[PDB]
């Protein structure tokens, strides 16, 4: 039962990300779009990583006007079940998507000969579906328990509980191991073998290969940025539980940091629309051309 | 809304799209090759051998079928076109790639390789489709030279000034002036090629001769790296 | 070779050519006399068109 | 062309039968069959219908449950099971071709049956008030229940005429269209419930029944028959 | 003397060009002014006819407007129920290689041809439920790049030998073969009384030619470079003809002369198809800009573009009562128009 800072920097960090994240992950929804139309499968994880974004974007204010308000959560105890697992979900959503993004283009490029059935647009959709399904069953622990966590601190507190319960601290560690560093290992071996078959391609002057590698760095590094503190914090204030669960020791001070490094992982939401359809020359075509559509 | 006979008609559609659909699945997994050369280049004994080890008389296209590690290749040449070219060339500009075999040991017409080259590499329509020739008859080069008697100085006065460029690999063991005039013909072909290329195609050359069972491997990697570049391009990932 | 090609010529030469005012008010007079009965021009009402 | 079909005998009622046609001369896989009978000395009724990839499966009210059709494309068989076998079916069982696309001829070729002998609703309903009739001109008639011209522009009805010692034969498909064999002097008019016939003069091979069929729902009702003699 | 032949065509044709240059005595343009512009005509996508593999070189509309044959380079012909969009029969050709389709008036057969250099034509109505291989005409040295009808037993088929021929289809040789051109021909058009037919080649000339006599009746030129498409206006007295220099051209078999130039600065693409509607006064041009335009046949100002190809527009065929125009292309999509 213990309150510190967080009315600053998360409040209009999520500001930020909104205001530049809806017109992005619009834009990369479009581009995603027309690739699919053109038979390429790419366009719909593209969609799906899309669609995740915005519905975090959208549901957003909520948590602007938690933050804000000094952790009041005004707007009822139904609201807090929904908008609140859109966003401590989509993150999950984005980052399984962007997974399969990166082993779609590792298949493509590594084996530009084979698995011509894996590569299709029924074969995107259904994927897509599967991927959907099983990551909102999988999150979906925290929806039957109702939270009802009010203290003698001036609080509300909309999904979040200090300390952690029983059943919170082994979704956190599933959420750690199986939401962010699993996804990120298929997306750092899918794009070392995508690095890898380039070495070998006589077309590709030099040049486009270095330029190769600073996009297939970035991709995997800005995951690191964005995700990296939240679930660090995560996986130790979880640990501090099941060795001692009835000292509020650790939970003291690392309280603000902790939200801190919540808002910050909001960034993988204009990072992405960035990665996946502005740096290229080509999406980016066809996004002017969206624009200039109207 | 509709009678039964129409009822019927639509199962009869739809059957006939399962079908269009199992056609397509073939139709993306197999790769067209279009071969061009001259008479006297040995593309005809090319196409036999290629029969031969892997898979009627004024007929214009003889399609040739053949694969290599379960991937599946469609080569077409025409057999019985005039001279003229600039129209039924439009036809191939979705193929995968251009083979084009070129006799090297003539230094005679071989001036009208390299004109055919060049029309053939700056074609409005073959953009994107990259080539991959064959330098044909290169054993029988090498022993046209070494018997001598035909200078290739007199036909290509640039060859006096050549020399070697670093990057040979001649793997037998041979005289140095058989490598130093095959590369000096590489190089020409391959100077009408980098003139613009512009990174949307290229040009793989090779040293053929046409008892060579290599062929059909060499022509796979580069369709492999061709699908590869293409690849990267539209995963956009370049 | 070339005694043929003369041949056509002249064969092609020796033709009854009428005005162009003539050939261009035929194809005029036959654009304005099947003119009711062409859908693109004046296009039918949306219930006699079969691709409705 | 032809359709050889087998399998019919003296069964026991309450017993069962498996009938068989089989086809040679043409694209089998692609036309959809039908097995029509008849009553040792009454007309013509529809029993079933399989269509080309055995997807769509009809029966007649009569057999809805008793009867089973089914068949096999690369073995060139047309089967029709049949089980607890009544004494209403009596008849002569027969083969039907019948394919549908835009133009085509539906119950274009029948085959000469197999005889099957059985020991001791909101559906159109055809019409054939007469029931007796060289060189001459002859206008069988007919009549319907409900109009059998769609919105298509098609009148789905169809002309066949049974020789005295054959199997029918299509003469005339959708109202209007002359099959293809028959000569000129058949022709048909109609206007949605009441038909027409017309044989423009009679040859001593114009003898025989004329029957009538609607295709404009299932099941398929024909009417009792119009005899010359 | 050599010398003497070659002066003595130099002067037939500085007089046919002198007599060619006295017969025209007004401009198309100058007497066609008083013509009404057609308007701009808005022309939709009633249907989409999904299907083919891939991309599409030829289609030809059905002489009762409803059926529609189409030929693709993935080794079909599809003929559709265009009203329905049902796909009536699926043929597998021998040559993938297509590159012109014919639908018999009668419609009990069809025609293809291609880099094969045969013109095979095809049994649509057997006893059989199957459509098969009528018969193949072989002779072509060059391809064969477009086929048309006259009856069920008389074809005409133009190749790139620089020669269309007549065949007489039970017999499978030849009849007659009709030389002249210079270079590939290209397109064809049979006259409405089929007496007679043009043909375009590579040669920037189009020719009249009489299917009986068997001789060369005209030659037409104006063109810049090689001719793609041609087709008789409905009258027969005359023929539109597209090209690889960005124009089309109405010629006249009577003035024997050139009448107007659809053209604009802003096309640089070559004319894939022409045809004309039923009254002659749109004619319908797909260019190599993924786009076909619509020109006023009379006064040659654009009268609609139907842009909703993404690749070139390869084929373009109006059909037989005016209702339809249907376009096919290189993105394997046919496209039917009101």
């Not at chain 1, 991709?219 to 539980?241: E, K, M, N, Q, T």
């Not at chain 4, 919105?151 to 109202?175: A, D, E, H, K, V």
């Not at chain 5, 017969?23 to 083919?52: E, F, K, Y």
Request: net charge neutral.
């Amino acid at each position: 039962v213990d309150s510190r800072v967080d009315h600053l920097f998360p409040p209009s960090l999520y500001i930020f990300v909104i205001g530049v994240g809806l017109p992005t992950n619009c834009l990369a929804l479009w581009a995603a779009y027309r690739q699919v139309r053109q038979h390429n499968e790419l366009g719909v994880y593209l969609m799906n990583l899309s669609i995740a974004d915005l519905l975090y974007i959208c549901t957003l204010p909520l948590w602007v006007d938690y933050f804000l308000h000094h952790d009041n959560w005004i707007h009822g105890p139904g609201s807090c079940k929904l908008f609140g697992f859109i966003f401590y979900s989509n993150i999950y959503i984005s980052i399984a998507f962007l997974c399969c993004i990166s082993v779609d283009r590792y298949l493509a490029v590594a084996h530009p000969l084979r698995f011509a059935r894996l590569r299709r647009v029924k074969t995107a959709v259904a994927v897509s579906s599967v991927v959907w399904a099983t990551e909102l069953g999988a999150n979906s622990a925290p929806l039957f328990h109702d939270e009802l966590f009010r203290d003698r601190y001036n609080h509300t507190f909309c999904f979040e509980k200090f300390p952690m319960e029983r059943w919170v601290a082994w979704m956190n560690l599933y959420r750690v191991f199986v939401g962010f560093l699993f996804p990120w290992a298929l997306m750092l071996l899918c794009y070392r073998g995508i690095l890898r078959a380039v070495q070998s391609s006589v077309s590709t002057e030099r040049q486009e290969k270095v330029k190769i590698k600073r996009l297939a760095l970035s991709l995997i590094a800005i995951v690191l940025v964005c995700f990296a503190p939240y679930h660090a914090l995560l996986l130790s204030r979880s640990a501090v539980y099941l060795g001692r669960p009835w000292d509020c020791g650790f939970e003291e001070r690392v309280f603000s940091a902790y939200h801190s490094s919540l808002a910050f992982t909001s960034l993988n939401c204009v990072a992405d629309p960035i990665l996946y359809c502005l740096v290229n020359e080509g999406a980016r075509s066809d996004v002017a051309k969206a624009l200039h559509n109207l | 809304t509709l009678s039964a006979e129409d009822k019927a008609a639509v199962e009869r559609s739809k059957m006939i799209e399962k079908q269009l659909q199992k056609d397509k699945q073939v139709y993306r997994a197999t790769h067209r090759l279009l071969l061009l050369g001259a008479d006297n280049s040995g593309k005809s004994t090319i196409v036999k051998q290629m029969r031969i080890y892997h898979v009627v008389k004024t007929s214009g296209i003889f399609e040739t079928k053949f694969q290599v590690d379960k991937v599946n290749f469609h080569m077409f040449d025409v057999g019985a076109q005039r001279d003229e070219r600039r129209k039924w060339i439009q036809c191939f500009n979705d193929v995968t790639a251009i083979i084009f075999v070129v006799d090297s040991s003539d230094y005679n017409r071989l001036q009208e390789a390299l004109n055919d080259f060049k029309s053939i590499w700056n074609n409005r329509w073959l953009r994107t489709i990259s080539v991959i020739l064959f330098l044909n008859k290169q054993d029988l080069l090498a022993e046209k030279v070494l018997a001598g008697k035909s200078k290739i100085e007199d036909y290509f006065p640039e060859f006096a000034r050549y020399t070697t460029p670093e990057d040979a690999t001649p793997e037998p063991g041979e005289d140095p002036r058989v490598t130093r005039a095959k590369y000096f013909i590489r190089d020409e072909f391959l100077r009408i090629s980098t003139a613009s290329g512009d990174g949307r195609h290229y040009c793989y050359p090779h040293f053929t001769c046409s008892v060579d069972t290599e062929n059909a491997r060499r022509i796979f990697n580069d369709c492999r790296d061709i699908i590869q570049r293409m690849h990267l391009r539209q995963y956009e990932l370049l | 070779q070339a005694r043929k090609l003369v041949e056509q010529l002249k064969m092609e030469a020796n033709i009854d050519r009428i005005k162009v005012s003539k050939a261009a008010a035929d194809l005029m007079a036959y654009c304005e006399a099947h003119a009711k009965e062409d859908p693109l021009l004046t296009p039918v009402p949306a219930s006699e068109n079969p691709f409705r | 062309v032809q359709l050889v079909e087998s399998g019919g005998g003296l069964v026991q009622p309450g017993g069962s039968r498996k009938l068989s046609c089989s086809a040679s001369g043409f694209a089998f896989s692609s036309f959809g069959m039908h097995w029509v009978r008849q009553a040792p000395e009454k007309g013509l009724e529809w029993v079933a219908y399989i269509s080309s990839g055995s997807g769509t499966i009809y029966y007649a009210d009569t057999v809805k449950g008793r009867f089973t059709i089914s068949r096999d494309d690369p073995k060139n068989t047309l089967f029709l099971q049949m089980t607890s076998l009544r004494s209403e079916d009596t008849a002569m069982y027969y083969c039907v071709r019948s394919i549908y696309y835009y133009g085509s001829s539906p119950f274009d070729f029948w085959g000469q049956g197999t005889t099957l002998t059985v020991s001791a609703s909101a559906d159109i309903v055809m019409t054939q008030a007469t029931s007796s009739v060289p060189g001459e001109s002859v206008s069988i008639s007919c009549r319907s229940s409900k109009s059998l011209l769609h919105s298509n522009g098609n009148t789905y009805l169809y002309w066949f005429l049974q020789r005295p010692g054959q199997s029918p034969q299509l003469l005339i498909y959708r109202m209007s269209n002359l099959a293809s064999g028959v000569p000129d002097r058949f022709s048909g008019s109609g206007s949605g419930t009441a038909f027409t016939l017309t044989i423009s003069r009679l040859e001593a091979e114009d003898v025989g029944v004329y029957y009538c069929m609607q295709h404009l729902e299932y099941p398929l009702t024909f009417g009792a028959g119009t005899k010359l003699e | 003397e050599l010398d003497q032949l070659r002066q003595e065509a130099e002067q037939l044709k500085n007089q046919i060009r002198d007599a060619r240059k006295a017969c025209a005595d007004a401009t198309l343009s100058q007497i066609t002014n008083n013509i009404d512009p057609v308007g701009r005509i808005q022309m939709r996508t009633r249907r989409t006819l999904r299907g083919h593999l891939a991309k599409i070189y030829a289609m030809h509309w059905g002489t009762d407007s409803r059926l529609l044959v189409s030929a693709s380079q993935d080794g079909k012909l599809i003929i559709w129920d265009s009203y329905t969009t049902n796909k009536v029969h699926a043929i597998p050709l021998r040559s993938s290689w297509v590159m012109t389709c014919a639908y018999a008036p009668s419609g009990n057969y069809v025609a293809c041809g291609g880099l094969d250099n045969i013109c095979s034509i095809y049994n649509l109505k057997t006893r059989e439920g199957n459509v098969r291989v009528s018969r193949e005409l072989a002779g072509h040295t060059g391809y064969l790049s477009c086929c048309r009808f006259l009856d069920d037993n008389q074809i005409v088929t133009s190749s790139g030998d620089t020669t269309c021929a007549l065949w007489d289809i039970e017999t499978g040789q030849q009849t007659t073969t009709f030389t002249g051109h210079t270079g590939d021909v290209m397109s064809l058009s049979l006259a409405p009384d089929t007496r007679l037919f043009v043909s375009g080649a590579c040669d920037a000339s189009a020719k009249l030619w009489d299917v009986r006599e068997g001789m060369c009746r005209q030659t037409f030129t104006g063109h810049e470079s090689d001719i793609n498409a041609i087709c008789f206006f409905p009258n027969g007295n005359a023929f539109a003809t597209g090209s690889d220099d960005a124009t089309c051209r109405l010629f006249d078999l009577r003035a024997d002369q050139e009448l107007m130039t659809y053209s604009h600065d802003n096309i640089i693409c070559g004319i894939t198809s022409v045809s004309f509607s039923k009254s002659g006064r749109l004619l319908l041009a797909g260019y190599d800009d993924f786009n076909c335009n619509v020109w006023d046949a009379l006064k040659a100002d654009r009268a609609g573009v139907l842009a909703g190809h993404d690749n070139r527009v390869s084929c373009l065929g109006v059909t037989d009562d005016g209702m339809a125009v249907a376009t096919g292309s290189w993105d394997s999509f046919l496209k039917i128009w009101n």
